[PDB]
Paper text:
A part of the KRASi pocket overlapped with that occupied by covalent G12C inhibitors, such as sotorasib and adagrasib, with the notable difference that the pan-KRASi engaged the pocket without relying on a covalent tether and did not extend in the P-loop channel near the G12 residue. In KRAS G12C-expressing BaF3 cells, the effect of BI-2865, a compound lacking the Michael acceptor needed for covalent bonding, was comparable to that of covalent KRAS G12C inhibitors BI-0474 and sotorasib. Mutations in several amino acids residing away from the drug-binding interface were also enriched with treatment.
Here we report the discovery and characterization of a non-covalent inhibitor that binds preferentially and with high affinity to the inactive state of KRAS while sparing NRAS and HRAS.
Numbering used by the authors: 0 to 169
Write the structure that this text describes.
């Protein structure tokens, strides 16, 4: 049967979670997508010659630590932690997202990729080295993306699938 991979995209409002997701789903850059819409989207993709079903939860809205919201995030098998390379605050938020993922998955070993989005823009405020070094601190991959140009989009999502496979084989 076709394996389904439940992927969750997290990070500060405005970093490009929806734009990244829609680039994967529609193969189109959407510069405008209601910041409050949290929803999931499926797509069949070929990754290393194996057709699989991705189920992407594009998170949005207010931070809430109810049991209900924990259970919804807990359905995720892997997480993209997204910041924007021109927004230092979004990068400084990453550790909070990672901490909450570890808590809700009750694991120090959750499949995860650090994503630096908006790589097409010139206004960088977060050095690549600092981002690479944070991913190293966590022991996870770092991928530079642009939802505008499609740079890194498959790399980010497909690496996460590969991380989930390797975790499932542990
Ligand atoms: C960086 C923060 O801001 C926001 C703003 C919006 N969301 C968050 C946020 N943190 O984790 C999460 C997720 C969705 C991530 C996956 C796992 C779980 S499990 C659960 N219950 C979740 C929730 N709500 C989450 N989201 N944080 C700063 C710092 C604290 C005050 N605050 C202003
Ligand atoms: N130049 C550029 N703008 C982007 C990129 N991704 C998203 N945006 C813009 O960033 C803003 C927020 O994007 P959105 O997808 O709504 O972010 P979300 O709140 O994380 O879902 C919008 O103005 C988008 O046009 C990107 O890679 N490059
Ligand atoms: Mg959004």
């Amino acid at each position: 049967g076709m394996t389904e991979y439940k992927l969750v995209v997290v990070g500060a409002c405005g970093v490009g979670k929806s734009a990244l997701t829609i680039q994967l789903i529609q193969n189109h850059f959407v510069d405008e997508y209601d910041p409050t819409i949290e929803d999931s989207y499926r797509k069949q993709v070929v990754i290393d010659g194996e057709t699989c079903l991705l189920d992407i939860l594009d998170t949005a809205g207010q931070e809430e630590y109810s049991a209900m919201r924990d259970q919804y995030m807990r359905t995720g098998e892997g997480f993209l932690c997204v910041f924007a390379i021109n927004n230092t605050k979004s990068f400084e938020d990453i550790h909070h997202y990672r901490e909450q993922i570890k808590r809700v998955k009750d694991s120090e070993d959750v499949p995860m990729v650090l994503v630096g989005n908006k790589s097409d823009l010139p206004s960088r405020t977060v050095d690549t080295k600092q981002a690479q070094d944070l991913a190293r601190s966590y022991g996870i991959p770092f991928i530079e993306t642009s939802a505008k140009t499609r740079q890194g989009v498959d790399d980010a999502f497909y690496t996460l699938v590969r991380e989930i496979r390797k975790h499932k084989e542990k």
